[PDB]
Amino acid sequence: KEVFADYEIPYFIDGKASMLNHPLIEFIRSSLDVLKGNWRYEAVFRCVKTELLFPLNEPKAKVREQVDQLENYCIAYGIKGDRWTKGDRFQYRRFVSLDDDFAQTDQEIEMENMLNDTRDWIVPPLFQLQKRMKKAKTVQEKAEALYRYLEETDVPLKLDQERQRAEDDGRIIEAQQHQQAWDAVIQLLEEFVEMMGDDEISLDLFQQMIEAGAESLTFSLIPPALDQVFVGNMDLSRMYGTSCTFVLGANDGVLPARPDENGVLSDDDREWLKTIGVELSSGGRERLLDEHFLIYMAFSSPSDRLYVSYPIADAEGKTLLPSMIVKRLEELFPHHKERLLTNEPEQVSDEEQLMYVVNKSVAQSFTASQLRLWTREYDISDVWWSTYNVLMSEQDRLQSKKLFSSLFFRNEVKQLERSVSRQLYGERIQGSVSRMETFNACPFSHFASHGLHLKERQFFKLEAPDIGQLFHSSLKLISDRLRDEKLDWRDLTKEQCELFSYDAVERLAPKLQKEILLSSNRHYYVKEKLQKIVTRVSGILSEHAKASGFVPIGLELGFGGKGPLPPLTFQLKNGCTMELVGRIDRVDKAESSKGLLLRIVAYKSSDKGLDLAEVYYGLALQMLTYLD
Amino acid sequence: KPADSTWTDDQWNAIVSTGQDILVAAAAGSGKTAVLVERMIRKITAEENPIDVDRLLVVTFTNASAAEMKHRIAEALEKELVQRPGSLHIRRQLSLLNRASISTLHSFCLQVLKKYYYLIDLDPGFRIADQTEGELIGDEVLDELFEDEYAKGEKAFFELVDRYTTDRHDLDLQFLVKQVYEYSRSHPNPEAWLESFVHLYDVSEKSAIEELPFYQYVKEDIAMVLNGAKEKLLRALELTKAPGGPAPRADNFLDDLAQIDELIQHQDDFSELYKRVPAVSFKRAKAVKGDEFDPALLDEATDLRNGAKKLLEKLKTDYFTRSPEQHLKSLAEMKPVIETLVQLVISYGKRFEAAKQEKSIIDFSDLEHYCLAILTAENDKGEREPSEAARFYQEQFHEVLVDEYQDTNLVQESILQLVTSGPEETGNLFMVGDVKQSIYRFRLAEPLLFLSKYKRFTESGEGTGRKIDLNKNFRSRADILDSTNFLFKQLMGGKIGEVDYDEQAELKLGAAYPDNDETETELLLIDNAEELETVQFEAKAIAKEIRKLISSPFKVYDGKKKTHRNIQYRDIVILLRSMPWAPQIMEELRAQGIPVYANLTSGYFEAVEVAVALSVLKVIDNPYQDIPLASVLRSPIVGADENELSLIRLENKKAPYYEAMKDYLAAGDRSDELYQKLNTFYGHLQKWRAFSKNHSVSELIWEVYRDTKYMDYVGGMPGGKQRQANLRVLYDRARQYESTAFRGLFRFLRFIERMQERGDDLGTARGLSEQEDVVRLMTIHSSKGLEFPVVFVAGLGRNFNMMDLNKSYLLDKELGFGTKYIHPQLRISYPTLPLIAMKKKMRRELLSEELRVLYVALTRAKEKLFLIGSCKDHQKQLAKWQASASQTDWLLPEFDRYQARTYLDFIGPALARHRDLHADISGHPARFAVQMIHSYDLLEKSERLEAIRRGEPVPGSFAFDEKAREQLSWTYPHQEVTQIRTKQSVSEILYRRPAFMMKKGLTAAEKGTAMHTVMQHIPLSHVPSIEEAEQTVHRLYEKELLTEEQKDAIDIEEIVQFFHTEIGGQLIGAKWKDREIPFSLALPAKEIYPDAHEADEPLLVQGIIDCLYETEDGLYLLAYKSDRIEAAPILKKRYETQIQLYTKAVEQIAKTKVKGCALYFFDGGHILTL
DNA sequence: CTAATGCGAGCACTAGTGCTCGCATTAGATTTTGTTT
Ligand SMILES: Nc1ncnc2c1ncn2[C@@H]1O[C@H](COP(=O)(O)OP(=O)(O)NP(=O)(O)O)[C@@H](O)[C@H]1O
Ligand SMILES: [Mg+2]
C-alpha cells in the first residue's frame, strides 16, 4: 500500500481490510475497558482520544487541546477509578513548595475550571453506561445499554460529519467505511441478542464476545477500477489475460508453504478416518504436495513476462533462505542471470540506476543518499547528477534544496541575538547558584531550562528532590518547635526525637507531591520509613550539638529575595544586572582566640562532600557561595 | 555393520550403533554434529527399511545451532538425491523436510502446546509474549501484590521488607522477588525448590556445622587456602636454600609452617579452627643484613610470607570472628524471614500466571513448563509417568537426537525423558556434546548431567547406555590445536574448570593443512603508558591486523574437498564475552572501510533520528509536552534555530511551549520565515492528529516520513545508512507491536515509554545482512558449534562479571537462598555461614565456566587466532605473571587460578613459561607471537559542493540528462481512468437503529419487496380474482418465499387492480413473456465520464428488469414501483435514466427495438408510459 | 577489591634509634551469556 502510493502505482488488493483501526470500534472496546478495569488511565484516555465523546459541534482542535491538558493532569495527579465518578471537583496547583501557602492564583483558577469543564462532559455518558450495565443482567439489556450509549453521545452524527469531511478532501473510500463500521457494529449486536438475548451473562463474558466479534470485523472489498495492478494470493485469486506476473517471496517455508495442523483433528486422525471411509478435508502431506500445482499455476499465469523474487533477510535483519524453486529454476534456465534488488543504487549498473528516477519524491530520496555517498569520495553514477540538475531546474527546487542541505548538516547552534537574549532572560537575571552551575555544565542545557523554560511531563511519583525537601522542612519544623519549648538539641531524648520527627513528617505529608504519601499503603510505609530517617537524624544532630562549640545562627536562612540576607549582585557590561537569590541550609557561629568563626552546613541526601576540581570548573559553587 | 569411509572408526561407531541410549563425548571439532547428521541421513536414505524424516526428533538449545543442523541435513539429503535421482522416497523426504521436527527444544515445546492445549489451562490461540510486554505484565502484578501485602499489614511482611530494602523505598525487594522467581523457573518443579529454602535455616545450637550440606563448600575453601598458605611458605623455604637466598629466615618459615600444618591437622574440625586460626601469630621476621644476600630474593621471600599472612587473616575474618554457636544462632534466627519470602514469591508466580492467562500469552519459561505439564500424567516427586501426549510422541519419534547436550538442564532433560522410548538400557536417545563446552550455568545447565551418564555408560552397549569417545579433530590447523592445548593443560583442572584436561581430552590433529608462514597464534597486549576508551585502542589494533591480513592475501583451504579460496571479510570473525564493547568496535572498523555485522540488542533509543521521530509521534499524541515539541522544532523536520525558539517563547513565557507556538502563529505575519516554518508544521500536526485516530501507528509513521522527508533527509547526513535503517525498523517494529497488543498511537507510545522506563532497550538497525561479505562481531556463546578461518578474541583484560557475589543474598541450585543476617531494628548486618559458603562455591563455579567459555572461543578458529587484551602496565604485569610461574607442573596453582579476575590472569602466567614470552612445557609445539603494543602507536574548495549548497544545478553535461528529464516529466497516458470504478449501478449513474430497539417489522421497503415478490410469481395465464391472488400469496408463504410478516403486509386489492389495466391486459395477452430479467451492459467510459478513451475499458452497468412482453406490435417493458403518491412529471424524471438504461440494454444486447415503456404504482394503481 | 598513607608501638639491635607490625581510612576502581514467529 505505502510503496505503491509513493511510486504512484494503482492497485487492487484481493483481500478485505480490518476495522480495528476505526474510531468506532476502539470507542466501543475502550469504553468496555473503562467499565471493566474501573476507569484506568489507559482505558479512559484510549476512549477519549477516539474523539467520539467530544462535545457536538465544538472545534475538534480546541477540544483536543483541552483533553491533552486534562491528560497531563491525570498523569500528574494519578487520577483513576471512582475519583472520576465521585464528583469531587479536580483541584489544580502549579508548584510544589513545602514552605509556601496553598493559596491559588488567577491562572490556576482559570486552569482548574478548564480541567473540570472537560471532565464534566467526559464522565456522564461513560458513567451512565456503567450504571445501566451493572443493572443489566441479560445479553439484550447490555446490548441495549451499549447502543443507547452510542446514541446518546451522538455517534451517528459524528460519523456522518466525518464522512462528509473525507468526501470533501477526496478520500471517498475512507468516507464510506464509517457507515460500514456502524452497520457492522449494529449487526454484531443484533446477532448477539438473536442467539443469546434472554440469557443472563456477566460483563466479563459480554466483553469477551464483543471483543471477538469486533476482532473478526472487516471492510468490504474496494471495487475494482478500469486500470490497476492486481495484487493477490496463490490459492484463491483468479486472473484472466495476465501479461506480466510478479511472484513474491519465494522463501523456504513460505513457498512451498509449511501446512498448518491447527485444528481439532490431527493429520493422523484425518489419515485414519480416511482409511475407514470418512472423507474430510486434506491433510498436511497432501496440501504440501499440492503446493507444486499452485506454484505451477502462478508461474504459467502470465502471457509475456514472469518475475520470481525473494528477500534474503526479514525486516529485522534475520536471514531468509531461498526456496527450492529458485534452484529448480536455475536448473531449467542455467544461462539466466539473477537480478539484484537493492535500495543502494551504487551496487547496480548505470542503466539500472536510471530505473530509480520514476518521480520527483523517489528521485529526491535517492539523490540525497547518493550525494552523501559522493562526499565519501565515491564516483556515483551520472544518473544522479542528471537527476540532480533536473530537480534544480524544477519550479520547486527549494524543497529539494532543503533536502540536500542535509549534506552540510552539523548540529550547529546560533548564538542568541542581543535583543532576543536580553528580552528572554530579562533586564535583571534573577537566578540561583543552581542555575549558574547548570550553565557551567552545558550552556545549551541552561538555555532549554532557564531560557525556554521547557518542563518535562510530570508524574504521580515520589522522586529524590521531593524527599529532600521533606527532610529539610522536617528538620526546620523540629528546630522551631525546639525553640518554642525552650528546648535545645542537646536536651532531646530518644522519645522526644521520635515524637517530633513523627509530628513533623505528619504535618508535611499532605503538602508533598500531590498527597502521594497518602495515596496508598505502600506509600504509607514509605512515609514511615522517612519518619525513621528523621528520627535517627534528630538523634545524631543531638549528639553533635553536645560535642560542638558551634551553635546554629540560622536554619534555612534565605539570602536575597525578601529574606534576611541581601542577594549577591553582579554588574554585566550590557548594563544587565545579575542577582543570585536562594537559601542557606545552616550557618554556625563559634567564638575563638582568632575571633568570631562561621561555618556552613548543608543537608545532603548523598555520601560525598566537596570536590575542589568541580569547584574550579564551576560545577560545585553553592557551599562556597554561602560561606562567602 | 562395518563400512569403508572417510569416517573414523569411532565416528562410524556413533553413526551406526543402535539399541540403547547413546552418548558421544568428544573435544571441539571432532565431528559430533557431522556424525549426528550422517546418522540421520543413513536412517532416512536406507535400502532395507527407510524411515521418513518426520519420525525423528532433532533438538538443540540454540536457534543458530538448529539452523545449522537443518542446513547440513538439507545439503546431505539432496546430495543423496543426486546419487539416486529415481527414488520416490528421497524426493518425498525433501518435501517432508519442511514438516520435520528439527529445531530448538523450545520450538518443539511450542508444537506440543499448540496440539495439546486442551490438557492444560491454555487457550489454543495463545501467543508468545516478547520480553518487554511479558515483564511489564510482571511489573504490574508485582505492584498489585505488594500493595495487597501492605494492606494486610502482617508483621512478617514488614519484617521481610525492612531487611531487604533501603531506608527510602522498596524497589530492592521488587528486584529480589523477580530474581528468585526467575531462578526458580529453571527447576523442573519451581515451587518445590522454593519450599526447600527453609531446610538450610532449620538448624539449632545442638547442630554440628560439619554435618550440614553447605559446610561442604566451607570445607573445600579452608582446605584450599591453608594448603595455599603452606604451598607459599614452602617456596619461601626453598628460597632460603638459593645462593642469594636468606638462610636465617628459614627458622621463621619452619615455625610458620609448623603453625599452618597444625591448622591442617584440624581442617575437618571447624570448632577447633575457631580456637586455633585467630590464635596464630607469625614471629617477627629475622633481619638479614649483608651483601651476600640477593636483594630481590630477600624481598621475594618477604612477599611470600606476607602472602601467607593475608591468606590466614582472610580465613579468620571469613569464618572465625564469630563462634560456631553464634553462626548457627544468626542462621536459625533468619528462618522466619525466609518463609515469608518463599510465600511471597509463590504468590507472585500464581498471580503472574493468572495475568498472562487473561491476555492469552506465555513466557519462554511457560513453553518448557507447560510442555512438561502436558507430557506428564502422574508426578510422584520426580517419578513422571507419560501422559497420552507423551505416548504419542514416543510412538511418532523413532529416535531423539540432541546436539550440544552439555547445555541440557534438568527441565529439558525431563522433557526428553518423556518423549524418548524405553529405558536407558534400550532407549532411542542419541546425544552428542562436550563438557569442556558447558557454558550455560545461568540456565542451570549442569556438567554433572553429562558426566553422570558418561560414568554410568560403558563402551560396550551391554546392560546400560553406550558411550563413544572421538579423539580426532578435523577442523583446525595444528597451530590452533597446539596453542589451545598448551593453554588449557595449565588452566583447566578438576578443581578450577570442573574438568580434567588430560591426554584423552587434548585436541589431536586429524586435518591436513598446507602450512603458512604467519599462522602462528598472536597475542596483542596493549599498554596505558604516558580521551579514548580502551575498547577503541583494542579495536584499532584489530582493524590494523585485519588490514594486514588483507594487504598480504590470505589462503583459505577447503580441506573438505581440495580447493583454495582467497580470503574474504566473511572469513574473519571477532568474538567477545559481551556486546557492550561491540558498537565502539564497529564504529572504528567501519571508519576504516572494514564492513561489520553484529546482532545488537541495545542502543536504538539513543540514536538522534529515533529520539526525533519518537518526539514527533509524542507531539501527535499530546503536543503539550514541552521537550518533545522543542525537539521536533529544532530537528531538521522544522529547522527552527535557537533564536527562533526563544522568539516563540517570548510570545508566552508562563504557558506550555505549544501554547506559545500557537500564539506566535496567532500574532505573526505570513511574510516571516519563522511563521512559515511553524505554520507548515502546525498544519502537518493537525493533519497527523486527525490521521492517527483512523489509521494504524505504522501508516502514521510512513505518512510522517512522507510529509517531512526526514528519512530522506537523514540519508544525507553522516551515518546516513545507519540512520535510515533505524527509521525503517521504527516502522517495522510499529508493525509488529500494533499486531500484538499495542495497536494505535497512544498504546504504542505508552509501550515504548514503559519499555525504556524499566531499562529495557532495542538494538540499532542493521544494513548489511549476516549472509553478506562482512566481518562478524558476535558473542562467544553464539559462536558455539561454528567454525571460522580467522578468529579474533577481544576484551581479555575485561573483568569477569562477578556482581552476584556482592549482594546481600545469593541463589544456589543445590542450597537455595543464602543471605546475610540482617536486623532492621539493631541496624546490623553480616554474612551467615551459608552465604559465605555459597559465595566461595559460586566463585569457583563461575571461574570454571569462564575457562570453558575461553575454550569454546579458541576452538572456533580454523587457521588463525588473535588474543587481544589491555592492562595498565606491561612490565608490572609481566612481573606478576612470572611470580606465579616458577612451578614445573603443567597445572598452575589452584589458589592462584582461583584469584583470577580477567582472562589475562589466566592466559598470562600460562604463557610466561613459554620460550616466546622444562622441555616439556617450553618445548611444546605451540607458537605464540607476542606484540607489546602501546596505546599511542595504534592511533580546499569544491565546485559541486558549493553548487549544491547554493541550490544551483551543477554545471556540465551528463550521459543521462535527457532520459532523466523525460522520465521525471512522464505521466501515465491513462491516469484519469485508474480510479474510475469499473462496475456501476443504475442508481450510481443513514445510520440505522438495531432490530431489538424498533417496533415490529413492516417497513416501506419490506412491504414493497413483498408486493414485488407476488408480481413476479402471480400466474399470467389469465386475470386473477382476489381469491386467486390471496392463494398465490399463501403458496408463497408455504414455500417460504414470503415470511409471515411479509404475507400479512399485502394489499391484494392493489395488485389485482393491475390486471384490470390496459398494460396488464396486454401483458396477459402476449406472444412471449418474462419476469425478473437480469442484465449486464457495457457502456464505454466516456459516456459516463468525460476524458475516457476508446482503448479504455467500458464500464459495466448491472440491473434487473421487472417484466418484458412481446405482442404483434413489438416489445414492451414493464416495471413496478411502490412509490408513495396518494406527481406524474416528477416520477417520470425520477426513473427516466433507469428506464433509458433498461431500453438501451435490450436494444443493444437483444438487437431488438423497444416500443413503449410502462411503470405501475401500487398506490392508486397508476400507470405512466415512457 | 586493592593500594597507598600515615600514625603510633613494639621488638631488637648496637637507652635510643631502626624498621617491622598493626590499624584505620581514603582513593581509585568497574561497566552479561540464551530461549519464538
Ligand atoms: N571424518 C572426517 N573427515 C573429514 N572432515 C571431517 C570428518 N569429521 C568431521 N570433519 C569436519 O571437521 C569439522 C568439525 O566437525 P563438527 O561437526 O563441527 O565437529 P563438532 O564436534 O560438532 N565441533 P563442536 O560443536 O565445536 O564440538 C567440520 O568441517 C566437519 O566437516
Ligand atoms: Mg557441533
Grid cell at residue A215? 476482532
Judged by C1' against the alpha carbon of B806, the nearest nucleotide is: C1
Q: Among A321, A325, A362, A390, which would you mutate to test the B interface (most chain B Cβ atoms within 10 Å of its Cβ)?
A: A390
- C-alpha–C-alpha distance, residues A606 and A603, integer Å: 9
User: Does the beta carbon of B34 sit less than 6 angstroms from any atom of ligand 1?
Assistant: yes
Whether residue B761 sits in one domain with residue B639: yes
Separation of alpha carbons A288 and A599, rounded Å: 87
User: How far apart are the C-alpha atoms of B1008 and B1025, rounded to whole Å?
Assistant: 21
Q: Check if B484 has its Cβ closer than 6 Å to any atom of ligand 1.
A: no
Query: What nucleotides of chain C have any atom within 7 angstroms of a protein Cβ?
Result: 1-2, 11-13, 19-22, 30-37
Task: Give the up-direction half-sphere exposure of residue B473: CA atoms within 13 A in the CB hemisphere.
Answer: 25
CA triple A374-A380-A382, angle to 5 deg = 125
- Cα(B638)–Cα(B650) distance, rounded to whole angstroms? 19
In a domain, residue B579? The reply is yes
Containing structural domain, residue B995? 956-1170
Are the Cβ atoms of B623 and A68 closer than 8 angstroms? yes
Ramachandran angles phi, psi of B671, nearest 5°: -90, -15
Q: Are A47 and B722 in contact (CB under 8 A)?
A: no
Q: Count CB-CB contacts under 10 A for residue B1098.
A: 16
Crossing angle for the helix pair B155-164 and B171-184, to the nearest 10 degrees: 100
Are A312 and B771 an interchain contact pair (Cβ–Cβ within 8 Å)? yes
What residues are paired with A558 via a beta bridge? Answer: A583
Q: Do residues B29 and B122 both lie within one domain?
A: yes
Amino acid occupying residue B1167: I
Which residue is it, cell 479536580? A90
**C-alpha–C-alpha distance, residues B704 and B683, integer Å:** 12
How many contacts (CB atoms, under 8 Å) link A and B? 317
Per DSSP, the residues of A291-344 read HHHHHHHHHTS-SSEEEE---SB-TTS-B-PBPHHHHHHHHHSTTPPPPP--S-
Residue with minimal CA–C1' distance to C13 is B287
Q: Looking at this protein, which amino acid is placed at residue A577?
A: T
Nearest one of B798, B832, B802 to B815, comparing CA atoms? B832
Phi, psi of A377 (to 5 degrees): 55, 45
Q: Does A154 touch chain B (CB under 8 A)?
A: no
β-strand pairing of B861-870 with B788-794: parallel
The SS3 of residue B934 is strand
The angle at the Cα of B384, spanning B381 to B390, to the nearest 5 degrees, equals 160
Q: Exposed/middle/buried for B138, CB within 10 Å: 0-12, 13-18, 19+?
A: buried
Distance of alpha carbon B68 from alpha carbon B58, whole angstroms: 12
Domain assignment present for residue B950? The answer is no
- Non-local (6+) Cβ contacts of A230 within 8 A are A11, A12, A14, A237, A239, A242
- Amino acid letter, B221: D
Q: Which residues pair with B1079 in a beta bridge?
A: B1103
List residues, by chain if needed, whose CB lies under 5 Å from ion ligand 2: B 33, 785
Contact indicator for B435, B23 with CB cutoff of 8 Å: no
Assess whether B514 and B582 both reside in one domain. yes
Map grid coordinates 500445482 to a residue. Answer: A293
Question: Same domain for B1013 and B1160?
Answer: yes
Cell numbers describing residue B143: 505492584
Contact between residue A353 and residue A388 where contact means Cβ atoms under 8 Å apart: no
**Residue among B953, B968, B1085 whose CB faces A363 most closely:** B968
Say yes or no: CB of residue B434 within 6 Å of ligand 1.
yes
Please tell me what DSSP assigns to residue A55.
Answer: P
Q: Name the residue with cell 535517627.
A: A536
Contacts of B578 (CB under 8 A, 6+ apart): B779, B795, B801
Angstrom distance (rounded) from CA B923 to CA B861: 23
Domain count of chain B? 6
Long-range contacts of A95-98 (CB under 8 A, 24+ apart): A96/A466, A96/A469, A96/A512, A96/A513, A96/A514, A98/A469, A98/A470, A98/A472, A98/A473, A98/A508, A98/A511, A98/A512
Tell which residue, B181, B198, B199, has the closest CA to residue B190: B181
Cβ of residue B104 near strand C, that is under 7 Å? yes
Residue type, A159: L
For residues B271 and B322, is the Cβ–Cβ distance under 8 A?
no
Whole-angstrom Cα distance, residue B210 to residue A388? 84
CA of B38 to the centre of ligand 2 (A): 13
Instruction: Return the axis-axis angle of helices B608-621 and B745-757, rounded to nearest 10°.
Output: 130
> Cβ of B577 < 7 Å from strand C?
yes
Measured distance CA(B344)–CA(B337) in Å, rounded? 11
Q: Which three cell numbers stand for residue A354?
A: 536510471
String of DSSP letters for A460-525: S---HHHHHHHHHHHHHHHHHHHHHTT--GGG--HHHHHHHHHHHHHHHTTTSGGGGGGS-HHHHH
Q: What CATH number should be reported for the domain holding residue B254?
A: 6.10.250.2380
| Residue among B369, B450, B446, B456 at smallest CA distance from B402 | B450
Handedness of CA B97, B98, B103, B108 (dihedral sign): negative
Contacts of A539 (CB under 8 A, 6+ apart): A492, A494, A497
Q: How far is the C-alpha of B326 from the C-alpha of B318, rounded, in Å?
A: 14
Number of C-beta neighbours around residue A25 at 10 A: 21
* Residue B526 sits in the same domain as residue B566: yes
What's the CA gap between B247 and B290, in Å, rounded? 12
B973 and B1104 both lie in a single domain: yes
B34 alpha carbon – ligand 2 mean position (Å): 7
Cβ atoms of B734 and B697 within 8 Å: the answer is yes
The answer to whether residues B1077 and B1037 touch, using CB atoms and an 8 Å cutoff, is no
What is A571-595 written as a DSSP string? E-TTS-EEEE-EEEEEEEEEE-SS-
Residue B675 Cβ < 7 Å to strand C: no
Where are the extended beta strands (E) located within B656-753?
none
Distance from C-alpha of B591 to C-alpha of A54, rounded to nearest angstrom: 54
Nearest-angstrom CA–CA distance, B596 and B542: 12
* CB neighbours of residue A383 within 10 Å: 28
Asked whether strand C has any atom less than 7 Å from the CB of B401, the reply is no
In a domain, B947, yes or no: no
Among A147, A154, A137, which Cα is nearest to A51's?
A: A154
Minimal Cα–Cα distance from A177 to chain B, Å?
Answer: 11
CB of A23 less than 8 A from some CB of B: yes
What is the distance between the alpha carbons of residues B981 and B970, in angstroms, rounded to a whole number?
24
CB of residue B31 inside a 6 A radius of ligand 1: yes
For A130-167, b/e burial (b = at least 16 CB within 10 A) is beebeebebbbbbbbbbbebbeebbbbebbbebbeebe
**3-state secondary structure at position B851:** helix
Which CATH number characterizes residue B493's domain? 3.40.50.300
Experimental determination technique: X-ray
The CA–C1' separation of B808 and C32, in angstroms, is 20
A576 among annotated binding-site residues: no
Bridge partner residues of B822 (DSSP): B829
Q: Cα angle vertex A358, ends A356, A364, to 5°?
A: 75
Task: Give the pairing of strands B1099-1110 and B1072-1083.
Answer: antiparallel
CA B568: distance to chain centroid?
29
Q: How is residue B9 annotated by DSSP?
A: H
- β-strand A582-591 against B1115-1121: which pairing, if any? unpaired
Rounded Cα–Cα distance for residues B337 and A614 (Å): 45
How many C-beta atoms surround the C-beta of residue B687 within 10 A?
Answer: 14
Q: How far apart are CA A307 and CA A16, in angstroms?
A: 26
Distance (Å, rounded) from C-alpha A130 to C-alpha A84?
12
Write the DSSP assignment of A241-256 as a string of letters. Answer: S--EEEE---BTTTTT
Q: Does A358 touch chain B if contact means CB atoms closer than 8 Å? A: yes
Of B650, B528, B462, the C-alpha closest to B936 is B528
Which residues of A, range 514-543, sit inside 8 Å of B by Cβ? 520-522, 524-526, 529-530, 532-533
Rounded CA-CA distance B1071/B1109 in Å is 7
Determine the distance separating the centroid of ligand 2 and the alpha carbon of B432, expressed in angstroms.
8
- A256 prior amide bond cis, ω within 30: yes
Check whether residue B110 has its CB closer than 7 Å to nucleic acid strand C.
yes
- Own/partner long-range contacts of B995-1001 (Cβ < 8 Å, ≥24 apart): B995/A190, B995/A193, B995/A194, B996/A140, B996/A143, B996/A144, B996/A189, B996/A190, B996/A193, B996/A197, B997/A144, B997/A147, B1000/B1045, B1001/B1045, B1001/B1049
Q: Is residue B1038 part of a domain?
A: yes
Asked if A517 and A462 touch (Cβ cutoff 8 Å), the reply is yes
Best CA proximity match to A24, nearest among A51, A6, A42, A57: A51
Proximity of residue B1089 CB to strand C below 7 A: no
The reply to whether B619 and B731 lie within a common domain is yes
Please state the separation of Cα B46 from the chain's center in Å.
38
- For residue A59 the three cell numbers come to 472545534
* B1013 Cα to the center of ligand 2, angstroms: 77
C-beta separation of B121 from B379 below 8 A: no
Domain end position, chosen among B470, B497, B519 = B470
Residue B325 has which C-alpha cell? 554457636
d(CA B832, CA B328): 8
CA of B265 to C1' of C21 (A): 28
Residue with cell 583446525: B476
Within the 544-603 window of chain A, which residues sit less than 8 Å (CB to CB) from chain B? none
Residue B758 lies in a domain: yes
Residue B1086 lies in a domain: yes
From B279, B170, B270, B176, select the one nearest B223 (Cα to Cα). B270
B624, three cell numbers: 503539550
- The runs of H, that is alpha helices, within B377-502 are 388-396, 410-419, 447-456, 478-488
**Strand C interface, B 862-901, C-beta < 7 A:** 899, 901
Handedness of CA B238, B239, B240, B242 (dihedral sign): positive
Say if CB A138 and CB A35 are below 8 A apart: no
**Residues in chain B closer than 8 A to A288 (CB atoms):** 95, 98-99
- Residue B945: inside a domain: no
Please, are residues A39 and A80 in contact by the beta-carbon 8 Å criterion?
Answer: yes
Residues B4 and B102 in one domain: yes
How many residues make up chain B in this entry?
Answer: 1170
Nearest to B694 by CA among A69, A215, A27: A27
Where are any strands of DSSP class E within B854-923?
861-870
Residue B442 beta carbon within 7 A of nucleic strand C: yes
Strand, coil or helix: what is B1035? helix
Q: Any alpha helices (H) in B293-400, and if so which ranges?
A: 295-319, 324-333, 335-358, 365-375, 388-396
Query: How far is Cα A518 from Cα A540, in angstroms, rounded to an integer?
Result: 28
Are residues B1118 and B1153 both part of a single domain? yes
- Is residue A558 within 8 Å of A432, Cβ to Cβ? no
Domain end, chosen from B409, B435, B470, is at B470
- Rounded Cα–Cα distance for residues B71 and B65 (Å): 10
Distance separating alpha carbons of residues B386 and B414, to the nearest angstrom: 11
Strand A568-571 and strand A577-580: the pairing is antiparallel
B1096: left (phi over 0), alpha (psi -120 to 50) or beta: beta
Neighbours of B971 (CB within 10 A): 8
Cell of residue B883, nine digits = 611470580
H-helix or E-strand containing B1079? Answer: strand B1072-1083
Check which CATH number belongs to the domain holding B167 and give it: 1.10.274.50
Is the C-beta atom of B11 inside 6 A of ligand 1? yes
User: How wide is the angle at C-alpha B706 spanned by C-alphas B703 and B708, nearest 5°?
Assistant: 105
Sign of the CA dihedral running A362, A368, A369, A374: positive
Degrees (nearest 5) of the Cα angle A460, A463, A464? 165
- Pocket probe for ligand 1: among B8, B33, B780, the residue whose CB has the most ligand atoms within 8 Å is B33
Ligand 1 site, residue B33, Cβ cutoff 6 A? yes
Let me know: does B393 contact A268? Beta carbons within 8 Å. no
Q: Is B187 in the pocket of ligand 1 (CB under 6 A)?
A: no
Q: Please check if B11 is assigned to a binding site.
A: yes
CATH number for position B1103: 3.90.320.10
Residue ending a domain, among B452, B470, B488, is B470
> Measured between alpha carbons, how far is B36 from B98 in angstroms, rounded to an integer?
19
What does each C-alpha distance from A36 to A29, A125, A201, A381, B227 come to in angstroms?
10, 16, 14, 62, 68
Q: Which ligand is nearest to the CA of B72?
A: 1
- Size of chain A in residues: 628
Claim to verify: residue B101 and residue B38 sit in the same structural domain: yes
Pocket lining: B475 vs ligand 1, CB cutoff 6 Å: yes
Which residue, chain included where needed, has cell 518463609?
B339
The answer to whether residues B756 and B799 belong to one domain is no
Q: Is B578 a member of any domain?
A: yes
- Nearest by CB to B693, from A51, A285, A315: name it: A51
Strand C lies under 7 A from the Cβ of residue B249: no
What is the Cα–Cα distance from B880 to B890, expressed in whole angstroms? 18
The answer to whether residue A147 neighbours chain B at the CB level (below 8 Å) is: yes
What is the nearest CA distance from B644 to chain A, expressed in angstroms?
9
- A387 neighbors A369 (Cβ within 8 angstroms): no
| Ligand 1 atom at shortest distance from the alpha carbon of B29 | 23
- Taking CA atoms only, the protein residue closest to ligand 1 atom 5 is B474
Minimum-distance nucleotide, CA of B850 to C1': C33
Identify whether residues B1022 and B1147 lie together within a single domain: yes
Tell me the one-letter amino acid at B442. F
Q: Are B76 and B334 in contact (CB under 8 A)?
A: no
Check the CA dihedral B312-B317-B322-B325 and report its sign.
negative
Q: Of all helices (H) and strands (E), which one includes residue B492?
A: none
**Residue B61 CB in 7 A reach of strand C:** yes
B502-510 contacts at long range (C-beta below 8 A, 24 or more positions apart): B504/B469, B504/B471, B505/B27, B505/B436, B506/B27, B507/B27, B507/B28, B507/B29, B507/B473, B507/B476, B507/B481, B507/B859, B508/B471, B508/B472, B508/B473, B508/B481, B509/B472, B509/B473, B509/B478, B509/B481, B510/B8, B510/B472, B510/B473, B510/B474
DSSP B210-229: GGSTTHHHHHHHHHHHHHHH
Nearest to B585, CA basis, from B777, B726, B772, B454 = B777
C-alpha cell, A17: 481490510
